[PDB]
Amino acid sequence: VLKENMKTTYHMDGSVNGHYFTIEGEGTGNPFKGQQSLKLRVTKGGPLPFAFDILSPTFNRVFTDYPEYMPDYFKRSLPEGYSWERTMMYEDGATATASVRISLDKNGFVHKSTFHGENFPANGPVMKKKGVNWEPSSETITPSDGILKGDVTMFLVLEGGQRLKALFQTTYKANKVVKMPPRHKIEHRLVRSEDGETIQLQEHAVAKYFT
């Protein structure tokens, strides 16, 4: 059952510019209100020599506020769950891919991810750890042959105020056949903070039709 207070355990293996790392952590949130808060720790390869923000959107569209009148592909995928694949193309030529499987154990969600980043400029804002936070965004969600496609133009706010642009494209694939929504959008607000060792993420997400 999907709880009003739903927990997640996270495991990520990844590399950025050939630097391998591992992240583990926990989350809690209200999936029906599209709210979640995460506590993440670097367990291998820390301190990360890159801005954590390029990883944060990898750490679950179940935590989206969907109206009753719109099909919720992600909540309908439960308890079987779903997986997703994502490409992230930065305007400076840097590229990243992410792969995630979302499933359940007795305590809540199990979130297992991989992340491969390369060709971020060595003296760019990401390797110099100048990321602050992503801007709020609007992701277009489009059905296509059993899976959903997501398309969102992202802007990472840097120290000093300039913005690094990247195009995110995601495919979302339920582990069973589920009824699928029409084209719509999801409005995101993802905020990163820090508590000593712990990297903290909070996301709010709401689904809406266009117009």
Domain edges within the chain: 6-208
Resolution (A): 1.8
Asked if residues 31 and 132 have their Cβ atoms less than 8 Å apart, the reply is no
Q: HSE of 187 in the Cβ direction (CA atoms, 13 Å)?
A: 6
CA-closest candidate to residue 82, choices 179, 180, 174, 2:
174
Give the residue among 203, 170, 165 at the shortest CA–CA distance from 187.
203
Look up residue 159 and give its two tokens: 């120290």
DSSP string for residues in the chain: ---SSEEEEEEEEEEETTEEEEEEEEEEEEGGGTEEEEEEEEEESPSPSS-GGGTGGG--TTSSB--TTS--HHHHTTTT-EEEEEEEEETTS-EEEEEEEEEEETTEEEEEEEEEEE---TTSTTTTT-EEEEPPEEEEEEEETTEEEEEEEEEEEETTS-EEEEEEEEEEEESS------SEEEEEEEEEEEETTEEEEEEEEEEE---
Burial pattern 175-204, b for ≥16 Cβ within 10 A else e, equals eeebebbeebbbbbebebeeeeeebebebb
The technique is X-ray
Question: 6-208 sits in which CATH class?
Answer: mainly beta
